[PDB]
Design a protein around this ligand. Structure first.
Ligand SMILES: CCCCCCCCCCCCCCCCCC(=O)OC[C@H](COP(=O)([O-])OCC(O)COP(=O)([O-])OC[C@@H](COC(=O)CCCCCCCCCCCCCCCCC)OC(=O)CCCCCCCCCCCCCCCCC)OC(=O)CCCCCCCCCCCCCCCCC
Ligand SMILES: CCCCCCCCCCCCCC(=O)SCCNC(=O)CCNC(=O)[C@@H](O)C(C)(C)COP(=O)(O)O
Ligand code: SF4
Ligand code: SF4
Ligand SMILES: [Zn+2]
Lengths: 95, 113, 176, 52, 96, 43, 126, 114, 208, 52
């Protein structure tokens, strides 16, 4: 979900864009500002919330030893989902 | 048997090794007599030089003398005798049996700091 | 337990003396050298046809850096700065903050590719396989600052080479 | 594990460039000998010390 | 390997060596670029009992060095070790 | 376990000595061929 | 004799190759660094440290990196006592300021004080 | 306060060595300007030698000025034998460096340095 | 403590302790300490007036024969008043052994050059002049060996900064490589890594 | 020498500066088929020394 300043410059997933009166836009004159158009904050929002029947879930990001350190997430709050701290996949107790 | 070469470059074959070792050992002891008797250098060097001189006097063969002097070739045993003689002639002038000239400071050899 | 190189006393019978003199006058070892050079003239050379043929690499190869993603689009870097604590060149500069959903993510992930010694301590220190040192080695630039990668360039290298990087990690990760 | 490999030590005789050349070539020979002994006597097991 | 036998014989005559038995170009004798996955073993401390770290703590058995002399009879003269044993000439190939 | 190991009998023998194969004639034969070439040329 | 008598102050500022600006404008700070209150270990409070005053760090126009012009911005020296650090600062012509070592004063700890009969020092829970 | 000297027993032998080193530099300067083909005059280089000798004029320790004489002989040896290039000789003349602010007000204007 | 712990060599420890007593009692005029490490390396800490009489002893004595100077080293320890620690590493090929001869100086006291004992020292202590500033008296050719020709300061001193004080660049105005005061586009980032918990209780120093 | 740099690259990932032998052991275990290729190198390398 890349957006654009009034200067025409693309805003990154950080939120970085130069000011209009900043001289350092001259480095992109005749060249391009390389941004990545796959924003991870939007791509993890696209993932569905996993309904599990347990009270404590374990996440390793998939792949076993190719993901992250395995963590255990508590699902006793019903207002909030249980979000993994590494991969951002969020879980919910189904009851 | 007239060993053809010593194997070490610059170290030539000694034709008469026994008499050379005897002369160097007696000259070491004659120089070493000028050191005071309480010095440990004189006691230790007299001890090892008397051992080497008795081993030289106890063996006519060159190669058996090489195996029981335990110093390799006989010519590097001769070279070590020359080095010990030069050392003892320097130890007379240095006089290192004297007490320690200066104590180090209080944390001079304290590691880690 | 040792051997004497060059301690051969030569023979002085007329056979060996005439052999050495024929070697001197008729240049036997020089024709032996010409024969060895002529032997390599008729061998197939070892030259590969670069750029069309490529030198063989292993999946452990340490080339261009890339920040990876999980198989959902979420980036693997959780801003923990182990790759810049371990970095022997101090080539990695990291600044972080919680982003808009509360995830521990970087805002600055710089690698100076002209400080980097390409030793791969960052990919082996990374707890979540975020920074890797991929298989690209043909990335020479015309300007010095094009080798000063920010997070956008490294995430683009990840998106560019993930189909290869994931397979190399798949081939190697049981040695790690 | 160099006490468990068997190899020879080339010793020159004249102290020149040529004996040092022959020593380096024979050390390539003896390195091939040690590499054969390392390939035949390679044990199984771990590769880091098991002190984490 | 694709050399015809005339050039192959000329090459073996010029070198003086049978070159085809030991080619310096590599062919299908070498290992596959795709290998099966390994199963690497664990070390000796991967045990669930009698594995207390105080019985295998190498760094904490390092002591400070023993100060032999500090400035706060007819004993034998010593050397730093026994003298080195004379090396034996090679049984394999002494060049003798 | 599965690990890079030598095979069950180990590997084959590896040559490591000097092999300079001593080719060519004797010195007597080389001077014989040379003097015979000279005599054929002179005739 | 073989020993001369130098009753002058020990000063080696002409021999260290340090320019004048980084001798006579710097303020060395000789101090025992405080314990990080994130932690309870005290092994970083054991030695004296000499650092210098911080100079300007600015933004790199290309990357945003911390550009400096202070060569002494990373120089931290370790000393066993205060007087060794003072002697090393005076030897190099560094004007210094010294902060005294702040050891914690000893406490009075009683586990039974948590359960007193008439004193306010009871714990309301445990 | 009984220390082992380097060469000089007191300051008089020390000043003698300083003086002979100054003589050697003073004689060497025209040769240095010629064979390095420096773009300074001989008088300018001799003023630089006088400056480098007056910079260390505040020292009263014989060992410290003995080391200054030793390092000056080392610099002279690197000068006479052509071991320095033209660049190493001209590094005494800080010519690409802009002049530094000296008074309070210009140092206030440029930055934070005292 | 078999698999992961280094095996202790008690035989070499006893032999090196005995030879350290031997050297300490032959040369009591200069030997200040004798110590043996737990990995069996003998250090003979001597007085700096006895650099030549000790080293000529160990090189020439028939029970020592330290004919090889492996390495010569200085160590800057600024918390000592004699901050420089000159370290000789010696190899006896006859007795298959190594010894370490340690001594000390400050910036202003000269150490006697050991080229009269080991000509190998000719560059090493010269490097000690270049990197640390220790002067060596009666040296054949004492000058710099590793630094640039106009280099001010001794770099391996611990009060010398990591980057120097100057840096070079080519300048096309004067058509010359020039030196300027050092400015770094990125500063070296200093990492305070030391844990506040005691790592080795055997090396604990007693408090005040 | 190029083939031995291929050995280094197979075992560490770099051809020259491997950072492979570390305090504690080596960094990573030998990949499969590496020792077979070391044997195939060593089987031929004496002839290379011979023609040198
Ligand atoms: C001597 C004069 C040349 C005579 C021809 C010759 O010796 O050919 C090499 C031919 C092949 O030698 P090889 O190196 O063992 O072949 C292995 C190749 O891999 C086998 O060849 P390949 O598998 O690589 O096959 C492809 C190759 C096939 O190779 C050829 O076509 C050979 C070149 C023929 C001309 O064709 C090419 O690569 C096209 C090359 C085109 C230009 C060749 C040069 C032309 C020079 C004159 C203009 O040599 C012989 O068969 C022995 C010498 C016979 C001499 C006979 C009397 C004359
Ligand atoms: C072209 C470039 C060439 C660059 C050459 C650089 C050479 C640098 C050599 C520096 C050597 C020295 O600084 S030694 C000077 C140290 N001397 C002292 O501290 C003692 C004080 N010296 C003096 O007062 C000197 O004026 C005299 C001449 C020794 C005595 O004068 P006083 O009497 O009134
Ligand atoms: S790349 Fe890996 S090691 Fe570096 S900060 Fe990100 S998660 Fe941590
Ligand atoms: S490969 Fe090494 S030098 Fe390069 S970024 Fe990674 S840790 Fe730093
Ligand atoms: Zn997860």
């Amino acid at each position: 979900g890349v957006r654009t300043s009034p200067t025409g410059e693309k805003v990154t997933h950080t939120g970085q864009v130069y000011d209009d009166e900043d001289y350092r836009r001259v480095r992109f004159v005749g060249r391009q500002k390389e941004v990545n158009e796959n924003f991870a904050i939007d791509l993890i929002a696209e993932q569905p919330v996993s309904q599990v029947g347990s009270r404590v879930i374990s996440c390793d990001g998939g792949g076993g030893a190719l993901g992250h350190p395995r963590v255990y997430i508590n699902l006793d709050k019903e207002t909030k989902t249980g979000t993994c701290g590494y991969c951002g996949l969020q879980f919910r107790q189904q009851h | 048997l007239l060993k053809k070469t010593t194997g070490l470059v610059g170290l030539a074959v000694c034709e008469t090794p026994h008499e050379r070792l005897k002369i160097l050992y007696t000259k070491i002891l004659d120089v070493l007599g000028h050191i005071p008797k309480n010095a440990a250098y004189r006691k230790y060097t007299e001890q090892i030089t008397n051992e080497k001189l008795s081993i030289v006097k106890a063996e006519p063969d060159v190669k058996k003398l090489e195996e029981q002097l335990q110093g390799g070739q006989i010519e590097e045993v001769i070279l070590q005798a020359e080095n010990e003689l030069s050392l003892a002639r320097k130890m007379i002038q240095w006089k290192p049996w004297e007490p320690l000239v200066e104590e180090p400071p209080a944390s001079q050899w304290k590691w880690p700091i | 337990t040792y051997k004497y190189v060059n301690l051969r006393e030569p023979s002085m019978d007329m056979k060996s003396v005439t052999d050495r003199a024929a070697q001197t006058l008729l240049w036997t070892e020089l024709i032996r050298g010409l024969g060895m050079t002529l032997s390599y003239l008729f061998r197939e050379p070892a030259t590969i046809n670069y750029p069309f043929e490529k030198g063989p690499l292993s999946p452990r190869f340490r080339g261009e850096h890339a920040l990876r993603r999980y198989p959902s689009g979420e980036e693997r870097c959780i801003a923990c700065k182990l790759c810049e604590a371990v970095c022997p060149a101090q080539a990695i500069t990291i600044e972080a903050e919680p982003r808009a959903d509360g995830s521990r993510r970087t805002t600055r992930y710089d690698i100076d590719m002209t400080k980097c010694i390409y030793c791969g301590f960052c990919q082996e220190a990374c707890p979540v396989d975020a920074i890797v040192e991929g298989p690209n080695f043909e990335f020479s630039t015309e300007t010095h600052e094009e080798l000063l990668y920010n997070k956008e360039k490294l995430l683009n290298n990840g998106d560019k080479w993930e189909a290869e990087i994931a397979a190399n990690i798949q081939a190697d990760y049981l040695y790690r | 594990v160099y006490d468990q490999v068997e190899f020879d030590v080339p010793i020159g005789s004249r102290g020149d460039c040529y004996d040092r050349y022959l020593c380096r070539v024979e050390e390539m020979r003896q390195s091939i000998r040690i590499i054969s002994q390392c390939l035949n006597k390679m044990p199984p097991g771990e590769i880091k010390v098991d002190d984490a | 390997a694709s050399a015809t036998r005339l050039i192959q014989g000329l090459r073996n005559w010029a070198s003086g060596r049978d070159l085809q038995a030991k080619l310096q170009l590599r062919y299908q004798e070498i290992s596959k670029r795709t290998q099966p996955p390994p199963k690497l073993p664990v070390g000796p401390s991967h045990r669930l009992s009698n594995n207390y770290y105080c019985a295998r703590d190498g760094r904490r058995e390092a002591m400070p060095p023993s100060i032999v002399m500090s400035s706060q009879s007819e004993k034998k003269a010593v050397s730093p070790a026994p003298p080195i044993k004379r090396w034996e000439l090679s049984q394999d190939e002494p060049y003798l | 376990v599965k690990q890079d190991m030598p095979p069950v009998g180990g590997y084959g023998p590896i040559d490591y000595k000097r092999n300079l194969p001593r080719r060519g004639l004797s010195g007597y034969s080389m001077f014989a061929v040379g003097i015979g070439a000279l005599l054929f040329g002179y005739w | 004799t073989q020993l001369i008598t130098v009753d002058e102050k020990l000063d080696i500022t002409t021999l260290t190759g340090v320019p004048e600006e980084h001798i006579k404008t710097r303020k060395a700070r000789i101090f025992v660094p405080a314990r990080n209150n994130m932690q309870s270990g005290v092994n970083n409070t054991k030695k004296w440290k000499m650092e210098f005053d911080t100079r300007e760090r600015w933004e790199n126009p290309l990357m945003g990196w911390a550009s400096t012009a202070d060569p002494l911005s990373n120089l931290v020296l370790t000393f066993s006592t205060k007087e060794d650090a003072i002697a090393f600062a005076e030897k190099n012509g560094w004007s210094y300021d010294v902060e005294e070592r702040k050891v914690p004063k000893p406490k009075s700890k009683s586990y039974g004080a948590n359960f007193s009969w008439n004193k306010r020092t009871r714990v309301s829970t445990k | 306060t009984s220390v082992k000297p380097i060469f000089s027993r007191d300051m008089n032998e020390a000043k003698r060595r300083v003086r002979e080193l100054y003589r050697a530099w003073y004689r060497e300067v025209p040769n240095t300007v010629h064979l390095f083909q420096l773009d300074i005059s001989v008088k300018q280089g001799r003023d630089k030698v006088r400056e480098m000798f007056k910079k260390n004029a505040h020292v009263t320790d014989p060992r410290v000025v003995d080391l200054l004489v030793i390092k000056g002989k080392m610099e002279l040896e690197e000068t006479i034998n052509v071991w320095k290039q033209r660049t190493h000789v001209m590094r005494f003349f800080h010519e690409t460096e802009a002049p530094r602010p000296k008074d309070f007000l210009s140092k206030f204007y440029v930055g934070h340095d005292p | 403590t078999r698999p992961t712990v280094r095996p202790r060599n008690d035989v070499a420890h006893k032999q090196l302790s005995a030879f350290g007593e031997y050297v300490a009692e032959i040369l009591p005029k200069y030997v200040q300490q004798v110590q043996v490490s737990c990995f069996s390396e003998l250090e003979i800490c001597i007085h700096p007036d006895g650099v030549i009489p000790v080293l000529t002893f160990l090189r020439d004595h028939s029970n020592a024969q330290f004919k090889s100077l492996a390495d010569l080293t200085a160590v800057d320890i600024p918390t000592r008043q004699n901050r420089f620690e000159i370290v000789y590493n010696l190899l006896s090929l006859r007795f298959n052994s190594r010894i370490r001869v340690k001594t000390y100086t400050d910036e202003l006291t000269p150490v006697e050059s050991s080229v009269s004992v080991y000509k190998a020292a000719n560059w090493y202590e010269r490097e000690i002049w270049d990197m640390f500033g220790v002067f060596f008296a009666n040296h054949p050719d004492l000058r710099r060996i590793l630094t640039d020709y106009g280099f001010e300061g001794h770099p391996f001193r611990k009060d010398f900064p990591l980057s120097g004080y100057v840096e070079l660049r080519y300048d096309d105005e004067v058509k010359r490589v020039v030196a300027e005061p050092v400015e770094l586009a990125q500063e070296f980032r200093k990492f305070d890594l030391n844990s506040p918990w005691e790592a080795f209780p055997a090396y604990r120093q007693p408090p005040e | 020498r190029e083939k031995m740099f291929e050995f280094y690259e197979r075992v560490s990932g770099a051809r020259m500066h491997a950072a492979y032998v570390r305090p504690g052991g080596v960094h990573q275990d030998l990949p499969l088929g590496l020792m077979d290729d070391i044997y195939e190198f060593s089987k031929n390398f004496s002839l290379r020394i011979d023609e040198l």
